[PDB]
């Protein structure tokens, strides 16, 4: 009876499958709004008539009304308006896509039922600087960081910390010389130090390189914490032991358990943001100190959910969406 | 003395000169951040090292420390990255602009001091649907509304509501013959209900045409409320959209006083959104009914501010930024 709106795209049908199964068992209905099919293949309408609001969604599969949904789960959209480019003249394309995106994001904002994801929240989480500042305030250890377009500032930072990686806040890729080239986080060496003057045209995020003893991915669904680790140290050690030949669990994340202080601070980070989903990246140095790297509000979880027993993260998300788990209530009034 | 960071652009002195003058008269320093010149003509650096955060905005004449500011005013962010297109090779331009925008707006979001405007907040208030829903919940009278890409839903709305105007949620200029054409609010020709075919390719917002006895613009600064009125129905061009004759009507605005219930509801709107600035557009119909039309989270105020005596709205903004007026405190931890 209880209806749960889920925003996805057509290519993602796999991680949502187990969540939908567990919601079905929980006794709620799932309404799938595939976002790439808007506005071409779906039709959405919100109306205010005679003092009443009504929102209806027409799909190739079903026709539903949405003004009475119990919750919404907005998985961040990256491709809306598929096919509009071929249908509309060039002079109208930018404005039409702007209006489409604004109408849809505005509907998603207007939902006053409990929301797991919203456009303004995702936009707030795009600020990696605020992530680092908040994590430092909570008590997380974070790497030395310099976000800058100042060549002299970056050079001073690099000569000070002596082992610096450089990353963009938004990636880049290009097909050239017969092959795809992607930008990766890499150390600033003597060769790249020559091109530091070009920083004037676009900033970069420099960070002290944390030596990896462990790498951690932490998926948080409400107050459910799932930690996974890659033990680089023990992997490299096993590569010397002949008894470990052919056993390459070294490249696979294994479930692990966090120190209770780290988990407390993770839950506090989600409390400060007032969101019920998070994907946190951490690095454990050789000195066994935990470094926060970033939190992704839209991070994928299926690859690690398949490493749990019968998709525990999907069950967590389903219980959260059906109001069968403690929530950070974000209903609008 | 306290430092007030003002996010603006080089073509925006017209709205910030008086605010800067009154801030200086209040005893606080103004740090102007022109974002056209980022990152070409000024340098922005944020560093965390040795447990300390620093932020430096370096212009060719002055280095400003931003980590100890007491307030930021997100006023305008026009033409970020101006001049980069002529510096960078074309293959890097879009990605470099994405990175520049992410860095700038992420610094803006990461300011934990009191903020009059932030990216996440402005983008939440981009949702006109949530605006109308929250206004209806507060008690405002709003026009009958249908936002959709579904032609038959629009047809039903247009036949049930006979006098209906069409509206875009976003602003956009389309270039034809080097001419900039735009889409005002236009009444929907009730025979022209063919050609709503087009509605599938891009949605639109239809509303019951409200007859305009007068039109109101209400600028709210904290708890200060400056209401102005205009008679729109004396220009056949400005009769459906006063902005269509705006430059002629720009000095015909008259100060007005709202009924106390309308003012209480406007203050309650700003309380619900938890912002200290707003530009609310309303329409008073011949039957003396006050209709909420829109709230602009970053609307213009200078042309009404110049109709007061000695720029009262700029003075109120300066007092709010210098913490001499009650705030809806939004500091982060």
């Amino acid at each position: 009876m209880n209806k749960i709106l889920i925003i996805t795209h057509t290519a993602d049908n796999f991680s949502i499958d187990k969540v939908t199964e567990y919601i079905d068992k929980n006794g709620c209905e799932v309404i799938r709004f595939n976002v790439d099919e808007y506005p071409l293949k779906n039709k959405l309408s919100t109306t205010f008539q005679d003092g009443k609001w009504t929102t209806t969604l027409e799909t190739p599969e079903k026709k539903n009304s949405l003004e009475d949904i119990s919750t919404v789960w907005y998985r961040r959209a990256y491709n809306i308006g598929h096919g509009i480019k071929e249908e509309l003249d060039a002079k109208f394309y930018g404005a039409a896509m702007g209006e489409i995106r604004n109408t849809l994001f505005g509907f998603l904002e207007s939902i006053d039922a409990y929301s797991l994801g919203k456009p303004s929240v995702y936009r707030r989480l795009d600020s990696k600087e605020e992530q680092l500042k908040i994590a430092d305030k909570i008590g997380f250890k974070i790497p030395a960081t310099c976000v800058t377009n100042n060549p002299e500032e970056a050079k001073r930072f690099i000569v000070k910390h002596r082992d610096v990686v450089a990353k963009m806040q938004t990636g880049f890729a290009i097909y050239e010389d017969g092959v795809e080239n992607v930008v990766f986080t890499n150390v600033v060496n003597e060769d790249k130090l020559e091109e530091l003057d070009t920083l004037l045209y676009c900033p970069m995020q420099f960070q002290k390189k944390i030596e990896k003893k462990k790498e951690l991915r932490i998926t948080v669904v409400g107050r459910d914490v799932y930690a996974f680790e890659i033990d680089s140290q023990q992997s490299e050690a096993a590569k010397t032991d002949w008894r470990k030949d052919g056993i390459n669990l070294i490249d696979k994340w294994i479930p692990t358990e966090l120190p209770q202080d780290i988990e407390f601070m993770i839950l506090e980070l989600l409390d400060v943001y007032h969101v019920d989903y998070g994907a946190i990246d951490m690095i454990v140095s050789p000195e066994d100190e935990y470094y926060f790297i970033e939190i992704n509000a839209a991070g994928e979880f299926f690859w690690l959910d398949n490493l749990t027993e019968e998709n525990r993260i999907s069950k967590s998300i389903a219980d959260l969406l059906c109001d069968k788990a403690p929530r950070r209530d974000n209903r609008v009034l | 003395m306290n430092k007030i960071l003002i996010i603006t652009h080089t073509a925006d002195n017209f709205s910030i000169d008086k605010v800067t003058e009154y801030i200086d008269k209040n005893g606080c320093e103004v740090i102007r951040f022109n974002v056209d010149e980022y990152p070409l003509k000024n340098k922005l650096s944020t560093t965390f090292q040795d447990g300390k955060w620093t932020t430096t905005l370096e212009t060719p004449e002055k280095k400003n420390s931003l980590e100890d500011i007491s307030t930021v005013w997100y006023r305008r962010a026009y033409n970020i990255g101006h001049g980069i297109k002529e510096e960078l090779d074309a293959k890097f331009y879009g990605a470099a602009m994405g990175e520049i925008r992410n860095t700038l707006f992420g610094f803006l979001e990461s300011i934990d001091a009191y903020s009059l405007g932030k990216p996440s907040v402005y983008r939440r208030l981009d949702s006109k649907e949530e605006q109308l829903k929250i206004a209806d919940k507060i008690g405002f009278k709003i026009p009958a509304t249908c936002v959709t890409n579904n032609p038959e839903e629009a047809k039903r709305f247009i036949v049930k509501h006979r006098d209906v105007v069409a509206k875009m949620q976003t602003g956009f200029a389309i270039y034809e013959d080097g001419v900039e054409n735009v889409v005002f609010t236009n009444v929907v020709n009730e025979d022209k209900l063919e050609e709503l075919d087009t509605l599938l390719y891009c949605p639109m917002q239809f509303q019951k045409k409200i007859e305009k006895k007068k039109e109101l613009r209400i600028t709210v600064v904290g708890r200060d409320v400056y209401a102005f009125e205009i008679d729109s129905q004396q220009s056949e061009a400005a009769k459906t959209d006063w902005r269509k004759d705006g430059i002629n009507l720009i000095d015909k605005w008259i100060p007005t006083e709202l009924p106390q219930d309308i003012e209480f509801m406007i203050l309650e709107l700003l309380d619900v959104y938890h912002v200290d600035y707003g530009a609310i557009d309303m329409i008073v119909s011949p039957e003396d009914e006050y209709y909420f039309i829109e709230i602009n989270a970053a609307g213009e105020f200078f042309w009404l501010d110049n109709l007061t005596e000695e720029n009262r709205i700029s003075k109120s903004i300066a007092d709010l930024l210098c913490d001499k007026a009650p705030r809806r405190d939004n500091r982060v931890l």
Partner: peptide
């Protein structure tokens, strides 16, 4: 010209 991140392009 080229931005700084262009110096971090790698194969695949």
């Amino acid at each position: 010209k080229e931005p700084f991140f262009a110096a971090f392009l790698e194969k695949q």
